[PDB]
């Protein structure tokens, strides 16, 4: 497996900072199993999300769950069994900032990793025990699916 | 005993490539292999990256003295 | 008369009057030395975490 993160979130607020971009919406989410939080920009034109909804979230570093080599090139002419076919919404962007709440203490209780999916930003703050895999300039994928119960 | 800049300046490169490009024209012999251009400035600028231009420069200090630096030994930017 | 060494005979000259800057590496102005050293002190603090 090449999974760097996996949790089931829950949308609690949408655009509180007032900056309402067209076709992009903020999603202040919170986890339920853990106590992490999430800021996510999704494409509303393609994959709409409203508040109160709950969705699976997986952040991988490769789609090839077997034979992990993460070559980093898109070929639409290749059909191979990958990880993307299980989920509905797949992004691809760098990690550009890791800035926690430390006070001269390495790997503190709060650690925030900032991912930028070609412009669509993402904050993933929580316990630093989960976010070990994230380094600066690490090409990670975002994999997402909404589940209703 | 020569104490000036070891770096070739911009005007040094301009005059060396100018005269060397005229030291290519009028059937003058060339010292690198060429992919086939007709502009002598490209030819003279490829010998600069080759450090094959043999020109010695007399950098006139204002007394009337000079130091003889070589384009072979001058460090381009 | 060690006062002639206690009181130094002058301050030392600027680093680009003595030891000219075109040949002699790391001979910069006093203002630029102060700027480089303040940024080294700040850079170590931000690169600590």
Swiss-Prot record, chain A:
Record carries keyword Acetylation: yes
Cited InterPro entries: NA-bd_OB-fold, RPABC3
Subcellular location: Nucleus; Nucleus, Nucleolus
Region of interest (Non-specific ssDNA binding), residue spans: 15-39
UniProtKB keywords: Acetylation, DNA-binding, DNA-directed RNA polymerase, Nucleus, Transcription
Pfam family, one: RNA_pol_Rpb8
UniProt entry tagged with the keyword Nucleotide-binding: no
Gene Ontology, cellular component aspect: cytosol; nucleoplasm; nucleus; protein-DNA complex; RNA polymerase I complex; RNA polymerase II, core complex; RNA polymerase III complex
Modified residues (N-acetylalanine): 1
GO annotation, biological process: transcription by RNA polymerase II
Subunit structure: Component of the RNA polymerase I (Pol I), RNA polymerase II (Pol II) and RNA polymerase III (Pol III) complexes consisting of at least 13, 12 and 17 subunits, respectively. Pol I complex consists of a ten-subunit catalytic core composed of POLR1A/RPA1, POLR1B/RPA2, POLR1C/RPAC1, POLR1D/RPAC2, POLR1H/RPA12, POLR2E/RPABC1, POLR2F/RPABC2, POLR2H/RPABC3, POLR2K/RPABC4 and POLR2L/RPABC5; a mobile stalk subunit POLR1F/RPA43 protruding from the core and additional subunits homologous to general transcription factors POLR1E/RPA49 and POLR1G/RPA34.
Family membership noted in the UniProt record: Belongs to the eukaryotic RPB8 RNA polymerase subunit family.
Protein name (database record): DNA-directed RNA polymerases I, II, and III subunit RPABC3
Organism of this sequence: Homo sapiens
Curated annotation (Swiss-Prot), chain B:
Keyword Transcription: yes
GO cellular component: cytosol; fibrillar center; nucleoplasm; nucleus; RNA polymerase I complex; RNA polymerase II, core complex; RNA polymerase III complex
UniProt keyword annotation of Zinc present: no
One record GO biological process: tRNA transcription by RNA polymerase III
Key words, A-Z: Acetylation, DNA-directed RNA polymerase, Nucleus, Phosphoprotein, Transcription
Gene Ontology molecular function terms on file: DNA binding; DNA-directed RNA polymerase activity
Superkingdom to which the source organism belongs: Eukaryota
Summary of the function given for this chain in its UniProt record: DNA-dependent RNA polymerase catalyzes the transcription of DNA into RNA using the four ribonucleoside triphosphates as substrates. Common component of RNA polymerases I, II, and III which synthesize ribosomal RNA precursors, mRNA precursors and many functional non-coding RNAs, and small RNAs, such as 5S rRNA and tRNAs, respectively. Pol II is the central component of the basal RNA polymerase II transcription machinery. Pols are composed of mobile elements that move relative to each other.
Family: Belongs to the archaeal Rpo6/eukaryotic RPB6 RNA polymerase subunit family.
Name of the molecule in the record: DNA-directed RNA polymerases I, II, and III subunit RPABC2
Organism from which the protein derives: Homo sapiens (Human)
Residues of the full protein shown: 50 to 126 of 127
Curated annotation (Swiss-Prot), chain C:
Signal peptide coordinates: none
Subcellular localization, as worded in the UniProt entry: Nucleus, Nucleolus; Chromosome
Similarity-based family: Belongs to the RNA polymerase beta' chain family.
Complex and partners: Component of the RNA polymerase I (Pol I) complex consisting of 13 subunits: a ten-subunit catalytic core composed of POLR1A/RPA1, POLR1B/RPA2, POLR1C/RPAC1, POLR1D/RPAC2, POLR1H/RPA12, POLR2E/RPABC1, POLR2F/RPABC2, POLR2H/RPABC3, POLR2K/RPABC4 and POLR2L/RPABC5; a mobile stalk subunit POLR1F/RPA43 protruding from the core and additional subunits homologous to general transcription factors POLR1E/RPA49 and POLR1G/RPA34. Part of Pol I pre-initiation complex (PIC), in which Pol I core assembles with RRN3 and promoter-bound UTBF and SL1/TIF-IB complex.
UniProt free text on domains: The clamps form the DNA-binding cleft.
Disease: Acrofacial dysostosis, Cincinnati type: A form of acrofacial dysostosis, a group of disorders characterized by malformations of the craniofacial skeleton and, in some patients, the limbs. AFDCIN patients may also have structural cardiac defects and neurologic abnormalities including developmental delay, hypotonia, motor delay and seizures. AFDCIN inheritance is autosomal dominant. Leukodystrophy, hypomyelinating, 27: A form of hypomyelinating leukodystrophy, a group of heterogeneous disorders characterized by persistent deficit of myelin observed on brain imaging. HLD27 is an autosomal recessive form characterized by global developmental delay apparent from infancy, poor or absent speech, ataxic gait or inability to sit or walk, spasticity, and abnormal eye movements. Some patients have seizures. Brain imaging shows hypomyelinating leukodystrophy, cerebellar atrophy, and thin corpus callosum.
Listed name of the protein: DNA-directed RNA polymerase I subunit RPA1
Organism whose genome encodes this protein: Homo sapiens (Human)
Gene responsible for this protein: POLR1A
């Amino acid at each position: 497996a090449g999974i760097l993160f996996e949790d089931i979130f829950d949308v609690k607020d949408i655009d509180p900072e007032g900056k309402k971009f067209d076709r992009v919406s903020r999603l202040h989410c919170e986890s339920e199993s853990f106590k992490m939080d999430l800021i996510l920009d999704v494409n509303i034109q393609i994959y709409p999300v409203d508040l109160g909804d709950k969705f699976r979230l997986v952040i991988a570093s490769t789609l090839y769950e077997d034979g992990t080599l993460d070559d980093g090139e898109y070929n639409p002419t290749d059909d191979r069994p990958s990880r993307a076919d299980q989920f509905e919404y797949v992004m691809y962007g760098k990690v550009y900032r890791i800035e926690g709440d430390e006070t001269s203490t390495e790997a503190a209780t709060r650690l925030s990793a900032y991912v930028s999916y070609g412009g669509l930003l993402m904050r993933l703050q929580g316990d630093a025990n989960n976010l070990h895999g994230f380094e600066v300039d690490s090409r990670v994928y975002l994999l997402m699916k909404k589940l209703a119960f | 005993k020569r104490i000036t800049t070891p770096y070739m300046t911009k005007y040094e490169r301009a005059r060396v490539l100018g005269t060397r490009a005229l030291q290519i024209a009028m059937c003058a012999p060339v010292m690198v292999e060429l992919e086939g251009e007709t502009d002598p400035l490209l030819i003279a600028m490829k010998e600069l990256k080759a450090r094959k231009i043999p020109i010695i420069i007399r950098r006139y200090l204002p007394d009337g003295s000079y130091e003889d630096w070589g384009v072979d030994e001058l460090i381009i930017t | 008369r060690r006062k002639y060494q206690k009181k130094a005979a002058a301050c030392p000259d600027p680093s680009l009057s003595v030891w000219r800057p075109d040949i002699y590496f790391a001979s910069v102005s006093e203002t630029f030395e102060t700027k480089v050293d303040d940024y080294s002190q700040e850079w170590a603090a931000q690169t600590e975490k």
